[PDB]
Protein backbone atom coordinates (compact mmCIF):
# COMPACT_ATOMS: atom_id res chain seq x y z
CA UNK A 1 0.00 0.00 0.00
CA UNK A 2 0.92 3.69 0.34
CA UNK A 3 2.74 2.97 3.61
CA UNK A 4 6.01 3.37 1.67
CA UNK A 5 7.11 5.17 -1.49
CA UNK A 6 6.79 3.27 -4.77
CA UNK A 7 9.57 5.18 -6.56
CA UNK A 8 12.31 4.01 -4.18
CA UNK A 9 10.99 0.41 -4.01
CA UNK A 10 9.63 -0.14 -7.53
CA UNK A 11 7.73 -3.24 -8.59
CA UNK A 12 6.59 -4.46 -12.02
CA UNK A 13 2.94 -3.97 -13.07
CA UNK A 14 2.03 -7.40 -11.58
CA UNK A 15 0.40 -9.22 -14.48
CA UNK A 16 -1.52 -12.36 -13.48
CA UNK A 17 -3.43 -14.78 -15.72
CA UNK A 18 -7.12 -15.68 -15.59
CA UNK A 19 -8.40 -19.15 -14.62
CA UNK A 20 -9.15 -21.11 -17.80
CA UNK A 21 -9.99 -24.64 -16.62
CA UNK A 22 -9.99 -27.48 -19.14
CA UNK A 23 -12.01 -29.78 -16.85
CA UNK A 24 -15.27 -29.50 -14.93
CA UNK A 25 -13.93 -31.37 -11.91
CA UNK A 26 -14.24 -29.16 -8.79
CA UNK A 27 -11.06 -27.29 -7.90
CA UNK A 28 -10.00 -27.99 -4.29
CA UNK A 29 -7.85 -24.84 -4.12
CA UNK A 30 -10.76 -22.46 -4.75
CA UNK A 31 -13.04 -24.15 -2.21
CA UNK A 32 -10.23 -24.17 0.36
CA UNK A 33 -9.60 -20.49 -0.39
CA UNK A 34 -13.27 -19.69 0.21
CA UNK A 35 -13.19 -21.60 3.50
CA UNK A 36 -9.96 -19.83 4.48
CA UNK A 37 -11.13 -16.30 3.76
CA UNK A 38 -14.57 -16.79 5.32
CA UNK A 39 -13.16 -18.43 8.46
CA UNK A 40 -9.90 -16.45 8.92
CA UNK A 41 -9.74 -13.24 6.89
CA UNK A 42 -13.14 -11.79 7.82
CA UNK A 43 -12.61 -11.90 11.63
CA UNK A 44 -9.12 -10.48 11.11
CA UNK A 45 -10.56 -7.60 9.08
CA UNK A 46 -13.22 -6.81 11.69
CA UNK A 47 -10.64 -6.85 14.48
CA UNK A 48 -8.29 -4.66 12.45
CA UNK A 49 -10.96 -2.11 11.56
CA UNK A 50 -12.03 -1.93 15.21
CA UNK A 51 -8.42 -1.27 16.21
CA UNK A 52 -8.03 1.32 13.44
CA UNK A 53 -11.16 3.22 14.46
CA UNK A 54 -9.89 3.12 18.04
CA UNK A 55 -6.64 4.66 16.76
CA UNK A 56 -8.57 7.34 14.87
CA UNK A 57 -10.01 8.58 18.18
CA UNK A 58 -6.57 9.70 19.44
CA UNK A 59 -4.04 10.69 16.78
CA UNK A 60 -0.62 12.29 17.17
CA UNK A 61 2.32 13.00 14.89
CA UNK A 62 6.03 12.34 15.16
CA UNK A 63 8.38 14.32 12.92
CA UNK A 64 11.53 13.25 11.11
CA UNK A 65 14.46 15.20 12.54
CA UNK A 66 16.21 17.65 10.23
CA UNK A 67 19.92 18.44 10.41
CA UNK A 68 21.86 21.38 8.99
CA UNK A 69 24.93 21.21 6.73
CA UNK A 70 27.85 22.31 8.92
CA UNK A 71 31.38 22.75 7.48
CA UNK A 72 33.17 19.51 6.67
CA UNK A 73 36.64 18.28 7.61
CA UNK A 74 38.26 20.05 4.64
CA UNK A 75 37.24 23.48 6.01
CA UNK A 76 38.79 22.98 9.46
CA UNK A 77 42.11 24.26 10.76
CA UNK A 78 44.68 21.68 11.78
CA UNK A 79 43.86 21.85 15.51
CA UNK A 80 40.40 23.46 15.69
CA UNK A 81 38.72 20.92 17.95
CA UNK A 82 35.19 22.35 17.64
CA UNK A 83 35.09 22.46 13.84
CA UNK A 84 36.71 19.03 13.89
CA UNK A 85 33.94 17.71 16.16
CA UNK A 86 31.19 19.17 13.97
CA UNK A 87 32.74 17.78 10.79
CA UNK A 88 33.33 14.35 12.34
CA UNK A 89 29.72 14.03 13.51
CA UNK A 90 28.42 15.12 10.11
CA UNK A 91 30.72 12.63 8.35
CA UNK A 92 29.53 9.80 10.60
CA UNK A 93 25.89 10.63 9.87
CA UNK A 94 26.65 10.65 6.13
CA UNK A 95 28.36 7.26 6.54
CA UNK A 96 25.19 5.89 8.16
CA UNK A 97 23.06 7.30 5.33
CA UNK A 98 25.32 5.71 2.71
CA UNK A 99 25.08 2.39 4.55
CA UNK A 100 21.29 2.59 4.35
CA UNK A 101 21.48 3.48 0.64
CA UNK A 102 23.49 0.32 -0.01
CA UNK A 103 20.92 -1.57 2.07
CA UNK A 104 18.10 -0.21 -0.11
CA UNK A 105 19.82 -1.25 -3.33
CA UNK A 106 20.50 -4.71 -1.89
CA UNK A 107 16.82 -5.08 -0.99
CA UNK A 108 15.90 -4.11 -4.56
CA UNK A 109 18.27 -6.74 -5.94
CA UNK A 110 16.96 -9.49 -3.63
CA UNK A 111 13.34 -8.69 -4.51
CA UNK A 112 14.19 -8.78 -8.21
CA UNK A 113 15.89 -12.17 -7.90
CA UNK A 114 12.95 -13.69 -6.03
CA UNK A 115 10.29 -12.18 -8.29
CA UNK A 116 11.75 -13.08 -11.69
CA UNK A 117 11.68 -16.82 -11.04
CA UNK A 118 13.83 -18.69 -13.54
CA UNK A 119 14.59 -15.60 -15.67
CA UNK A 120 16.44 -13.73 -12.91
CA UNK A 121 19.80 -13.87 -14.70
CA UNK A 122 18.58 -11.74 -17.62
CA UNK A 123 15.67 -9.86 -16.04
CA UNK A 124 17.70 -8.49 -13.10
CA UNK A 125 20.50 -6.86 -15.08
CA UNK A 126 19.56 -3.28 -14.18
CA UNK A 127 19.41 -4.05 -10.45
CA UNK A 128 22.73 -5.89 -10.68
CA UNK A 129 24.45 -2.96 -12.39
CA UNK A 130 22.92 -0.52 -9.89
CA UNK A 131 24.31 -2.60 -7.03
CA UNK A 132 27.67 -2.80 -8.80
CA UNK A 133 27.86 0.99 -9.08
CA UNK A 134 26.70 1.64 -5.51
CA UNK A 135 29.07 -0.97 -4.06
CA UNK A 136 31.94 0.44 -6.12
CA UNK A 137 31.30 3.92 -4.74
CA UNK A 138 30.85 2.69 -1.18
CA UNK A 139 34.05 0.71 -1.47
CA UNK A 140 36.03 3.72 -2.65
CA UNK A 141 34.79 5.92 0.18
CA UNK A 142 35.02 3.61 3.19
CA UNK A 143 36.88 0.37 2.51
CA UNK A 144 40.12 -0.28 4.46
CA UNK A 145 39.58 2.50 7.01
CA UNK A 146 39.49 -0.15 9.73
CA UNK A 147 38.52 0.19 13.38
CA UNK A 148 39.04 3.76 14.56
CA UNK A 149 37.93 5.27 11.26
CA UNK A 150 37.43 9.02 11.05
CA UNK A 151 36.79 11.82 8.59
CA UNK A 152 40.53 12.51 8.42
CA UNK A 153 41.39 8.96 7.34
CA UNK A 154 38.68 9.03 4.68
CA UNK A 155 40.05 12.37 3.48
CA UNK A 156 43.59 10.98 3.32
CA UNK A 157 42.39 7.96 1.34
CA UNK A 158 40.53 10.24 -1.07
CA UNK A 159 43.58 12.47 -1.47
CA UNK A 160 45.80 9.47 -2.22
CA UNK A 161 43.33 8.21 -4.81
CA UNK A 162 43.11 11.66 -6.41
CA UNK A 163 46.90 11.93 -6.56
CA UNK A 164 47.12 8.54 -8.26
CA UNK A 165 44.36 9.47 -10.72
CA UNK A 166 46.02 12.79 -11.56
CA UNK A 167 49.40 11.13 -12.10
CA UNK A 168 47.82 8.51 -14.37
CA UNK A 169 45.89 11.13 -16.34
CA UNK A 170 48.92 13.36 -16.88
CA UNK A 171 51.03 10.34 -17.88
CA UNK A 172 48.41 9.26 -20.42
CA UNK A 173 48.26 12.86 -21.70
CA UNK A 174 52.00 12.56 -22.50
CA UNK A 175 51.32 10.22 -25.43
Amino acid sequence: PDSWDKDVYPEPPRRTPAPAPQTSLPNPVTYLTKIFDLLVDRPVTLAREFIEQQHAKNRYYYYHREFRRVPDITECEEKDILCMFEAEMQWRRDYKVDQEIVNIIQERLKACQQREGESYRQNCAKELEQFTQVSKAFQDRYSDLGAHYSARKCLAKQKQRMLAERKAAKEAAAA
Binding site: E75, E78, D144, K159
Partner: protein
Protein backbone atom coordinates in the same frame (compact mmCIF):
# COMPACT_ATOMS: atom_id res chain seq x y z
CA UNK B 1 64.72 24.31 42.34
CA UNK B 2 62.36 26.09 39.95
CA UNK B 3 60.21 28.03 42.41
CA UNK B 4 62.59 28.12 45.36
CA UNK B 5 64.09 31.48 44.47
CA UNK B 6 61.76 34.16 43.21
CA UNK B 7 61.90 37.96 43.46
CA UNK B 8 60.03 39.62 46.33
CA UNK B 9 59.29 36.47 48.31
CA UNK B 10 58.98 36.38 52.12
CA UNK B 11 60.72 33.23 53.45
CA UNK B 12 58.23 31.55 55.81
CA UNK B 13 55.00 33.36 54.94
CA UNK B 14 52.95 30.35 53.70
CA UNK B 15 50.37 32.82 52.40
CA UNK B 16 51.59 36.05 50.76
CA UNK B 17 49.52 39.22 50.74
CA UNK B 18 49.03 38.95 46.97
CA UNK B 19 47.13 35.68 47.52
CA UNK B 20 44.10 37.58 48.86
CA UNK B 21 43.23 38.76 45.33
CA UNK B 22 42.17 35.18 44.52
CA UNK B 23 38.73 33.66 45.10
CA UNK B 24 38.74 31.63 48.32
CA UNK B 25 37.76 27.97 48.05
CA UNK B 26 34.11 27.40 48.88
CA UNK B 27 33.32 25.75 52.19
CA UNK B 28 31.48 23.02 50.25
CA UNK B 29 34.56 22.33 48.13
CA UNK B 30 34.85 18.58 47.38
CA UNK B 31 38.48 18.60 48.53
CA UNK B 32 37.41 20.06 51.88
CA UNK B 33 34.74 17.36 52.12
CA UNK B 34 37.44 14.77 51.46
CA UNK B 35 39.56 16.31 54.23
CA UNK B 36 36.58 16.03 56.58
CA UNK B 37 36.17 12.41 55.50
CA UNK B 38 39.84 11.84 56.36
CA UNK B 39 39.19 13.32 59.79
CA UNK B 40 36.21 11.03 60.30
CA UNK B 41 38.31 8.02 59.28
CA UNK B 42 41.03 9.07 61.73
CA UNK B 43 38.44 9.28 64.49
CA UNK B 44 37.06 5.84 63.65
CA UNK B 45 40.55 4.31 63.58
CA UNK B 46 41.25 5.98 66.93
CA UNK B 47 38.12 4.36 68.36
CA UNK B 48 38.97 0.93 66.93
CA UNK B 49 42.61 0.92 68.07
CA UNK B 50 41.72 1.83 71.66
CA UNK B 51 39.03 -0.92 71.78
CA UNK B 52 36.00 1.37 71.91
CA UNK B 53 32.67 1.22 70.03
CA UNK B 54 33.89 2.39 66.66
CA UNK B 55 30.88 4.38 65.47
CA UNK B 56 29.68 5.84 68.78
CA UNK B 57 32.49 5.91 71.37
CA UNK B 58 33.69 9.50 71.38
CA UNK B 59 31.61 12.10 69.58
CA UNK B 60 33.45 15.18 70.85
CA UNK B 61 36.86 13.82 69.83
CA UNK B 62 35.54 12.68 66.44
CA UNK B 63 34.14 16.17 65.90
CA UNK B 64 37.52 17.63 66.86
CA UNK B 65 39.22 15.30 64.35
CA UNK B 66 36.86 16.35 61.56
CA UNK B 67 37.12 20.08 62.24
CA UNK B 68 40.92 19.95 62.60
CA UNK B 69 41.27 18.23 59.23
CA UNK B 70 38.87 20.71 57.59
CA UNK B 71 40.68 23.66 59.18
CA UNK B 72 44.09 22.57 57.92
CA UNK B 73 42.65 21.66 54.52
CA UNK B 74 41.19 25.11 53.91
CA UNK B 75 44.56 26.87 54.18
CA UNK B 76 46.26 24.02 52.31
CA UNK B 77 43.83 24.55 49.42
CA UNK B 78 44.37 28.31 49.51
CA UNK B 79 48.14 27.87 49.23
CA UNK B 80 47.74 25.25 46.49
CA UNK B 81 45.58 27.61 44.43
CA UNK B 82 47.98 30.50 45.01
CA UNK B 83 51.00 28.52 43.80
CA UNK B 84 49.17 27.32 40.68
CA UNK B 85 48.10 30.91 39.97
CA UNK B 86 51.73 32.02 40.31
CA UNK B 87 52.82 29.29 37.89
CA UNK B 88 50.30 30.39 35.27
CA UNK B 89 51.10 34.09 35.77
CA UNK B 90 54.83 33.52 35.33
CA UNK B 91 54.36 31.28 32.29
CA UNK B 92 52.08 33.79 30.56
CA UNK B 93 54.44 36.69 31.31
CA UNK B 94 57.42 34.73 29.98
CA UNK B 95 55.53 33.86 26.80
CA UNK B 96 54.56 37.50 26.32
CA UNK B 97 58.07 38.86 26.92
CA UNK B 98 59.78 36.39 24.52
CA UNK B 99 57.72 36.53 21.30
CA UNK B 100 60.40 35.00 19.07
CA UNK B 101 60.42 31.77 21.10
CA UNK B 102 56.63 31.28 20.86
CA UNK B 103 55.63 32.30 17.32
CA UNK B 104 52.12 31.86 15.99
CA UNK B 105 52.39 29.52 13.01
CA UNK B 106 50.32 29.67 9.84
CA UNK B 107 46.85 28.14 10.01
CA UNK B 108 46.43 25.24 7.59
CA UNK B 109 43.21 23.43 6.71
CA UNK B 110 42.84 19.68 6.37
CA UNK B 111 42.07 20.18 2.68
CA UNK B 112 45.65 21.39 2.16
CA UNK B 113 47.70 19.19 4.49
CA UNK B 114 48.65 15.86 2.89
CA UNK B 115 48.41 13.05 5.43
CA UNK B 116 49.60 9.64 4.28
CA UNK B 117 46.90 6.96 4.34
CA UNK B 118 47.54 3.54 5.86
CA UNK B 119 44.90 0.98 4.81
CA UNK B 120 43.72 -1.62 7.30
CA UNK B 121 43.69 -4.99 5.55
Amino acid sequence: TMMSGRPGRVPLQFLPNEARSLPPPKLTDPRLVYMGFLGYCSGLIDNAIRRRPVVSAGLHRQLLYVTSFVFFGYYLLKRQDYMYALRDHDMFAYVKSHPEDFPEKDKKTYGEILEEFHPVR
